Write a protein that binds this ligand. Structure first.
Ligand SMILES: CCCCCCCCCCCC(=O)OC[C@H](COP(=O)(O)OCC[N+](C)(C)C)OC(=O)CCCCCCCCCCC
Ligand SMILES: CCCCCCCCCCCC(=O)OC[C@H](COP(=O)(O)OCC[N+](C)(C)C)OC(=O)CCCCCCCCCCC
Ligand SMILES: CCCCCCCCCCCC(=O)OC[C@H](COP(=O)(O)OCC[N+](C)(C)C)OC(=O)CCCCCCCCCCC
Ligand SMILES: CCCCCCCCCCCC(=O)OC[C@H](COP(=O)(O)OCC[N+](C)(C)C)OC(=O)CCCCCCCCCCC
Ligand SMILES: CCCCCCCCCCCC(=O)OC[C@H](COP(=O)(O)OCC[N+](C)(C)C)OC(=O)CCCCCCCCCCC
Ligand SMILES: CCCCCCCCCCCC(=O)OC[C@H](COP(=O)(O)OCC[N+](C)(C)C)OC(=O)CCCCCCCCCCC
Ligand SMILES: CCCCCCCCCCCC(=O)OC[C@H](COP(=O)(O)OCC[N+](C)(C)C)OC(=O)CCCCCCCCCCC
Ligand SMILES: CCCCCCCCCCCC(=O)OC[C@H](COP(=O)(O)OCC[N+](C)(C)C)OC(=O)CCCCCCCCCCC
Ligand SMILES: CCCCCCCCCC(=O)OC[C@H](COP(=O)(O)OCC[N+](C)(C)C)OC(=O)CCCCCCCCC
Ligand SMILES: CCCCCCCCCC(=O)OC[C@H](COP(=O)(O)OCC[N+](C)(C)C)OC(=O)CCCCCCCCC
Ligand SMILES: CCCCCCCCCC(=O)OC[C@H](COP(=O)(O)OCC[N+](C)(C)C)OC(=O)CCCCCCCCC
Ligand SMILES: CCCCCCCCCC(=O)OC[C@H](COP(=O)(O)OCC[N+](C)(C)C)OC(=O)CCCCCCCCC
Ligand SMILES: CCCCCC(=O)OC[C@H](COP(=O)(O)OCC[N+](C)(C)C)OC(=O)CCCCC
Ligand SMILES: CCCCCC(=O)OC[C@H](COP(=O)(O)OCC[N+](C)(C)C)OC(=O)CCCCC
Ligand SMILES: CCCCCC(=O)OC[C@H](COP(=O)(O)OCC[N+](C)(C)C)OC(=O)CCCCC
Ligand SMILES: CCCCCC(=O)OC[C@H](COP(=O)(O)OCC[N+](C)(C)C)OC(=O)CCCCC
Ligand SMILES: CCCCCCCCCC
Ligand SMILES: CCCCCCCCCC
Ligand SMILES: [Cu+2]
Ligand SMILES: [Cu+2]
Ligand SMILES: [Cu+2]
Ligand SMILES: [Cu+2]
Ligand SMILES: [Cu+2]
Lengths: 236, 382, 241, 236, 123, 51, 52
């Protein structure tokens, strides 16, 4: 069996959900979403923010708790074939993390630039912001934490210790979410011009750099793949 | 010699120099030449140039071929930086004393704190004689007359040579013995503790004590001699007195301005309204150190630089006298080789294609009016 | 190899002279670049040799190379003249350029374009290192002295240039008149970073306060550049570039 | 034989060429060299720039290629006397590098200050600049590269690896030449005042610091000198 | 893409990372503007727009209103008194190439660190 | 302010000093697309060659 | 002018006058774009009730 169709679902769920989110923000961007003090803004974007925050907290708790509770206690008695299957599942988790990272840190971040570059921002919770920081970021944080936990709890290579590159790849992009405080503080106070290259934005950049730890993470996963079932063929 | 490289629009709209005069064209060593004139700070000062809050009246020249004896803005000496107001006209006077023989291109320039050099018209001034004859005497408040060419030179040479000799003596004292490889081997192979031993420490203590004592004694001696000293005098000088010019009786509205690419001419359409009570005629157009003259109306007699002077470079479609109260629109063409020599045609490379200048209107009796014009300058290619 | 003990000594002496040349002139080039691009403007002009900025900046930026060269030479050969050789090389390069270019090419007088004196500070730094070989003690005491002795060391040279003169209705020092008369087309007066007075300038404290600030910052810069020179001494073989 | 008269030539060639260059710039500094748009400027300084750039490229290529092609293949069968002779030749190369470094980074750099402090700079290619960056810098770069290549190809100590201090001493001062871009960019745009201590100049200073690697380079050459013919006498 | 291709080929040939940082980063900085010139050149055709000279890109920025992006925020070439002749683009390109050398040198080691396969025992 | 019609009917003509009239809605769009696609294809070809 | 020279606790003393900002304001002092009318005194030996 090895690599199964969980990868198709991993791609499709993010693609479909974010396409629907884009449709929603295209429909309610203007017209209930321009005026932050209008009653329709509360029903179409503040309610969205509340619901998405509650659902993200619940989903993160449930997913992480399930992954930690179903952790493999007897990692020693794991056959190489099962280890290969678990390595493929972890690679599917990493693919989902990469897809979510794309959707969060490229699509909704830059689309955000457009939003701000076109309208006068009315609040810290613009309909679009709600989408980026309160969805395009918690979702990829949840996916990254889940992938890290799966590696630690199913892969003997990633067990017996916390991998530094994986921890950086998982936590650095997470630090972008608390960095939103610097974004807000340095939008309203510091810097009144809508410039995407203003220093109030270097907190997003610095912690975006930590995603480069995916390189060490991926060579670690390559070594984990090539533990018992490394071949032969490769180097033979 | 530093202009013709600056942006054409920046040379056009910073500072307009006019009524420039030079006392002499050829001087001897120690002889004085005086440069006079007026400069107007343009209202449309470019945002890339800091406002002339801190400005210095300088001289454009290849090193001290002249010495600046005096410089005035208004009627008062300005040895320090000064504050200028945008839109104001000031009169200036620079006194130069010849120091080095040769043919020198002397510019009057204004350096602005955050915008760089604004170079005015330059004039060739010939200096004859020998540099050895140059003297720069000055009398101090302590009652002694010194020549600034060589004053304190001997003392400076003596002290620098003395301290250099002390350092060389230290180095040579340590350099009499073998220097690099045996000492490196001694330090590496085992503890060294043999290449620095008495009386080396005594010599170093003597060097340190002598250095401190000599510094203290020299400072005390230089305080007993020259007991009266003052710090360097610095600080921007405010309250420059601008010229109180009468309000012009001529109003000019620029209706489009074009220049051919390539070409040596600039064309503009002006609506001139004559107020007051005298028939006026357009006599000059000054844009950036270049004077386009209508020879039938006005002739230059102040010895303006020839390469910057267009004697008949200003052609007016209808330059008949303009009766008071009458308004007419004419096509004015300013054409001269200077427009390309001084790269005023390179405004096509500039990121701000706007020009500014001064129009000089003359009546029959000869009294003149200065009006300022500024408009976008549109290139034409076909 | 070498034939005998005598030929080894002669070879070592020749190596000594050649390596002294190499050290001296590489230091001249690098130190002069650093100095002229970190303190050059004050060092160029007597009317820039003020009590606040000149006294503050010059020792701070000039203690850099002496610290590194000391950390190498003393540590590896027990040669206590790193600071002296740095300062002598800087002075030689500066004087050569002043005489042949400032006064040679252009015709600015030497009494206008003379450099500052640094040998007293260099001697203090070197002797304080050789005695009490502690690099920390050097960085604290010798750098203090290097910063503090700068202005008194240069006072005999610049004091005659500070005689007051009544110049065309305005009070000016001789250095001020030099800067006024000898036109620097590229160097207007406002560029001059000199003492201009403040409302918090209490009494006659401008020179000593600047000297003490320069001494403290010299301690800091010496501490940093000791380790910078420690790194620059590395004899590692980076296998591939 | 050992140290031969190549050292005299090494000193004399730089001294004579740079004295002639100084005479040339004294004659044509003013009077064909003040106005960058005058026709005589093209014949006396732009032609100088073109000729010097072409000659520097040709000389660098020829010298480096010859030094690399004549590299000693059988370094193992090198007698200590020949090694001592080659060490002295490398020391002559280092002396030439030090002399060129002096001429480039002190004389023509500071004389440059004077030039700018006296005239209104008209272009990125002032007659004097042409001298400093397009001669006082390529010449010392060529000499440093040649010395490094000679060490690597004739000295067994400097073979079997790239010496880090030598590489720094050779490449850092080279980085001053591309740093001229920062000089130009931060002269015309940033900073309009002619101040030699302006931050637009810290690129020259930072890479001037890398010449301090001559200390590690010289202790390496001392060890190379003291390999077989270290004595005895020294430490005996 | 031209700069990226230069950087990659200069690395593969002459595998030296130092040589890449010096030469390939130089080329990456220098080829940026010439690489984009075929795209933006048609937008720089001069237009006489309501009495003022404007490029086509200028008219685009004027017409297509960016409510959050006023014109003054634009950090573009505005001319200086020390802008000599026609040197704005080449000078900027060479400065960018030098700074690209520096940034490439720094980020080579940054990526070296980010590749670490260490197991930080506890967080 | 109410706007009625279709966006497809919008035109933004402009006449340059070189004597050509262009519509700012789509002027240079084809050239931009072509050059970007060309360079992207070159990069993809490099990557696929190695892949 | 000073309303009183000797006061009791809780008593009010008023200081009046004029000040002229000199035209030749030194360049080392920033222009009085932001200025505060203060009282020079050794700590709150008086309290500033009003200032105009
Ligand atoms: C990592 C864990 C992430 C957790 C957060 C998830 C956020 C979900 C959206 C929040 C909506 C909100 O809050 O708003 C509630 C909205 C407000 O729209 P309405 O006014 O009712 O109009 C009618 C509804 N339309 C406008 C959508 C037609 O209505 C709803 O009930 C509909 C929400 C549907 C969400 C599920 C579909 C997603 C795409 C399919 C692939 C997954
Ligand atoms: C051997 C031990 C005994 C000697 C102890 C010396 C004590 C100080 C002497 C002051 C001389 C004087 O006269 O005051 C100070 C003189 C100016 O004097 P003024 O113009 O009269 O100032 C008018 C005001 N007054 C009357 C109150 C003095 O300069 C200075 O502002 C020097 C300021 C230095 C500040 C930084 C010091 C850092 C110290 C670091 C230590 C590790
Ligand atoms: C290891 C410590 C070595 C110290 C060596 C000191 C030698 C003597 C200097 C006399 C200075 C002078 O005469 O007074 C102060 C004057 C400045 O005076 P000014 O008011 O600016 O006027 C200038 C015009 N003059 C000279 C006609 C008045 O010079 C200085 O700026 C030196 C400041 C540093 C003094 C360091 C000593 C204090 C203790 C240091 C240890 C904590
Ligand atoms: C741990 C460090 C201990 C150091 C003790 C101090 C030794 C002083 C030697 C004599 C210097 C002198 O006399 O000259 C210093 C001159 C005085 O200048 P002046 O008063 O303005 O005018 C000149 C007046 N004369 C001609 C009479 C000298 O320069 C200065 O302003 C520097 C004074 C500040 C000194 C700060 C020391 C702080 C020490 C703190 C210890 C806990
Ligand atoms: C590391 C490799 C470095 C490579 C670069 C070398 C640059 C050489 C100079 C460029 C000249 C140029 O380009 O100009 C060409 C000049 C322009 O002068 P002219 O108008 O003909 O006047 C007449 C010539 N005078 C004014 C010199 C009298 O004329 C020439 O033909 C003469 C150039 C002579 C150069 C060789 C002598 C150097 C000193 C002797 C010790 C070596
Ligand atoms: C194959 C070897 C031979 C070729 C050698 C090329 C020499 C220079 C060519 C200049 C072209 C030209 O024309 O001048 C320069 C042209 C503009 O020209 P302009 O508008 O006429 O300038 C008017 C003034 N003038 C007449 C005196 C030229 O742009 C520039 O300002 C480019 C400035 C670049 C500065 C940074 C360079 C950093 C180099 C780093 C090296 C590692
Ligand atoms: C490894 C090195 C690879 C170099 C590849 C160069 C390809 C050819 C570029 C022609 C540029 C041009 O045509 O001239 C310069 C123009 C700018 O001109 P502008 O005056 O601002 O006007 C703009 C309007 N135009 C285009 C209608 C005139 O473009 C540039 O900004 C490129 C600057 C970098 C040039 C790099 C070559 C110099 C040597 C580099 C090695 C030290
Ligand atoms: C170690 C490095 C060696 C590199 C040698 C130089 C190769 C040049 C290749 C041709 C480029 C060209 O011709 O184009 C460069 C264009 C010229 O632009 P322009 O004159 O303004 O107008 C366009 C005029 N055309 C259409 C005739 C070209 O861009 C520039 O301004 C950059 C010029 C600065 C080059 C600085 C090189 C410094 C080298 C120093 C060596 C010691
Ligand atoms: C607690 C801090 C107070 C200051 C002390 C810091 C000095 C520490 C330096 C150090 O680590 O020791 C190095 C040398 C060791 O030499 P010794 O062989 O101990 O010589 C002792 C005899 N002597 C007093 C003449 C020195 O000893 C010395 O460095 C010299 C010791 C004499 C003090 C004065 C020297 C400095 C002159 C300016
Ligand atoms: C301006 C800052 C000053 C520059 C100083 C930084 C020097 C950094 C040290 C360094 O370069 O490391 C080299 C390694 C390559 O290692 P290797 O080539 O495997 O050498 C083996 C031994 N070694 C690992 C200890 C080097 O890393 C590499 O990938 C090779 C790059 C070497 C470039 C160093 C040259 C610096 C010249 C400016
Ligand atoms: C002193 C500095 C002058 C520049 C030299 C710096 C290059 C140093 C790079 C290096 O360390 O060596 C790596 C490779 C080794 O390959 P080799 O197996 O030596 O190949 C030799 C045959 N060859 C000439 C076709 C290359 O050799 C190469 O890197 C390629 C050598 C050919 C030079 C041109 C390559 C660069 C193209 C832009
Ligand atoms: C923005 C800057 C980039 C972040 C990169 C900094 C990483 C610093 C390295 C580090 O975290 O050291 C871990 C040690 C704890 O050590 P241990 O848990 O004992 O691990 C044993 C092996 N080890 C000592 C080599 C780690 O020190 C500790 O106390 C544990 C702290 C680990 C936190 C690292 C996670 C960084 C995520 C942002
Ligand atoms: C790899 C990221 C793909 C992002 C595509 C996207 O944002 O699609 C939304 C956009 C919306 O434009 P349109 O297709 O015209 O439909 C408009 C519907 N709304 C306004 C809700 C977006 O176009 C599509 O829906 C095309 C489907 C692409 C599937 C990968
Ligand atoms: C890594 C480079 C950081 C450079 C910081 C920067 O560009 O700041 C520009 C800003 C200058 O403000 P400005 O661009 O004029 O802002 C105009 C808009 N307002 C006045 C509303 C802020 O300076 C500061 O306020 C200090 C920044 C500290 C950085 C750690
Ligand atoms: C260690 C660096 C020596 C630099 C000396 C220098 O720049 O010399 C040029 C200068 C030029 O002044 P001068 O001798 O009067 O001859 C003028 C000739 N020009 C104007 C061409 C320089 O003086 C000399 O030629 C003296 C010879 C010294 C030999 C080490
Ligand atoms: C290591 C110390 C670096 C300090 C930088 C500095 O002194 O900059 C002064 C300058 C202030 O400009 P100013 O001196 O007023 O320049 C006057 C002349 N103009 C207006 C033409 C630039 O500030 C900046 O523009 C930011 C520098 C960033 C350094 C990484
Ligand atoms: C700021 C000073 C840092 C100097 C670096 C020295 C590193 C030494 C490692 C062997
Ligand atoms: C500024 C670049 C510093 C990169 C840090 C790399 C550290 C590697 C240690 C193994
Ligand atoms: Cu933001
Ligand atoms: Cu001139
Ligand atoms: Cu004016
Ligand atoms: Cu510079
Ligand atoms: Cu008053």
């Amino acid at each position: 069996l090895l690599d199964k169709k969980w990868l198709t679902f991993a791609l499709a769920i993010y693609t479909v959900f974010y396409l629907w989110v884009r449709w929603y923000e295209g429909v309610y961007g203007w017209s209930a979403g321009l005026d932050s003090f209008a009653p329709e803004f509360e029903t179409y974007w503040m309610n969205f923010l509340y619901t998405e925050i509650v659902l993200e907290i619940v989903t993160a708790s449930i997913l992480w708790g399930y992954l930690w509770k179903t952790r493999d206690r007897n990692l020693a008695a794991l056959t190489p074939r099962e280890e290969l299957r678990r390595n493929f599942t972890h690679l599917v988790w990493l693919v989902a993390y990469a897809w979510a990272i794309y959707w969060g840190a490229s699509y909704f971040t830059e689309q955000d630039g457009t939003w701000h570059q076109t309208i006068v921002r009315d609040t810290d919770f613009t309909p679009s912001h709600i989408i980026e920081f309160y969805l395009s970021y918690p979702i990829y944080i949840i996916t990254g934490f889940a992938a890290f936990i799966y590696a630690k709890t199913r892969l003997p290579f990633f067990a017996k210790g916390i991998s530094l590159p994986y921890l950086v790849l998982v936590v650095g992009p997470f630090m972008i979410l608390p960095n939103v405080g610097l974004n807000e503080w340095g939008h309203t106070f510091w810097f009144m011009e809508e410039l995407f290259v203003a220093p109030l934005h270097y907190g997003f950049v610095i912690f975006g750099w930590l995603a480069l730890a995916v390189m060490g993470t991926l060579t670690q996963t390559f070594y984990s793949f090539a533990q018992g079932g490394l071949g032969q063929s490769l180097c033979e | 010699h530093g202009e013709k490289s600056q942006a054409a629009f920046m040379r056009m709209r910073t500072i307009h120099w006019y009524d420039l005069s030079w006392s002499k064209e050829k001087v001897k060593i120690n002889e004085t030449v005086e440069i006079k004139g007026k400069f107007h700070v343009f209202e449309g000062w470019p945002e890339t140039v800091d406002e002339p809050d801190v400005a210095f009246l300088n001289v454009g020249m290849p090193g001290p071929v002249f010495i600046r004896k005096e410089s005035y803005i208004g009627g008062q000496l300005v040895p320090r930086s000064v504050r200028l107001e945008i839109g104001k006209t000031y009169d200036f006077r620079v006194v130069l004393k010849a120091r080095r023989p040769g043919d020198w291109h002397v510019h009057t320039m204004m350096n602005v704190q955050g915008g760089g050099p604004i170079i005015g018209p330059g004039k060739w001034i010939t200096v004859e004689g020998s540099m050895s004859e140059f003297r720069n005497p000055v009398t101090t408040l302590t009652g002694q007359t010194v020549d600034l060419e060589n004053y304190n030179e001997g003392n400076t040479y003596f002290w620098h040579a003395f301290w250099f000799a002390i350092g060389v003596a230290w180095i040579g004292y340590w350099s009499r013995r073998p220097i690099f490889i045996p000492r490196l081997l001694m330090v590496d192979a085992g503890r060294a503790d043999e290449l620095v031993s008495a009386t080396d420490r005594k010599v170093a203590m003597g060097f340190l004590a002598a250095t401190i004592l000599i510094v203290v004694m020299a400072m005390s001696s230089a305080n007993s001699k020259y007991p009266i000293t003052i710090p360097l005098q610095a600080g921007t000088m405010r309250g420059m007195k601008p010229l109180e010019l009468p309000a012009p009786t001529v109003s000019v509205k620029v209706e489009d301005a074009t220049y051919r690419v390539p070409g040596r001419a600039m064309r503009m359409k002006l609506t001139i309204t004559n107020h007051g009570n005298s028939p006026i005629r357009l006599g000059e157009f000054y844009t950036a150190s270049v004077r386009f003259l209508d020879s039938d109306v006005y002739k230059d007699t102040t010895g303006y630089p020839e390469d910057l002077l267009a004697e008949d470079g200003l052609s007016v479609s209808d330059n008949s006298p303009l009766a008071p109260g009458e308004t007419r629109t004419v096509d004015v063409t300013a054409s001269d080789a200077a427009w390309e020599v001084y790269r005023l045609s390179d405004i096509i490379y500039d990121p701000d294609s706007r020009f500014a200048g001064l129009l000089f209107f003359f009546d029959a009796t000869g009294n003149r009016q200065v009006v300022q014009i500024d408009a976008p300058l549109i290139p034409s290619f076909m | 190899a070498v034939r005998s003990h005598a030929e080894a000594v002669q070879v070592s002496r020749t190596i000594d002279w050649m390596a002294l040349f190499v050290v001296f002139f590489v230091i001249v080039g690098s130190y002069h670049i650093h100095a002229m691009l970190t303190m050059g403007d004050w060092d160029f002009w007597s009317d820039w040799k003020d009590r606040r900025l000149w006294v503050t900046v010059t020792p701070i930026v000039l203690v850099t190379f002496p610290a590194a060269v000391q950390s190498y030479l003393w540590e590896r050969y027990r040669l206590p003249w790193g600071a002296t050789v740095c300062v002598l090389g800087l002075l030689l390069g500066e004087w050569i350029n002043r005489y042949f270019n400032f006064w040679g090419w252009t015709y600015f007088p030497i009494n206008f374009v003379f450099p500052a004196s640094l040998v007293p500070g260099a001697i203090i730094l070197d002797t304080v290192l050789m005695l009490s070989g502690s690099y920390l003690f050097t960085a604290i005491v010798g750098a203090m002295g290097w910063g503090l002795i700068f202005y008194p060391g240069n006072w005999p040279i610049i004091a005659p240039l500070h005689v007051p003169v009544e110049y065309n209705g305005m009070l000016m020092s001789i250095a001020d008149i030099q800067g006024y008369n000898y036109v620097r087309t590229g160097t207007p007066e406002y560029i001059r970073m000199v003492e201009k007075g403040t409302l918090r300038t209490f009494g006659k404290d401008v020179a000593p306060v600047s000297a003490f600030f320069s001494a403290f910052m010299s301690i800091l810069i010496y501490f940093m550049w000791h380790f910078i020179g420690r790194w620059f001494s590395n004899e590692r073989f980076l296998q591939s570039t």
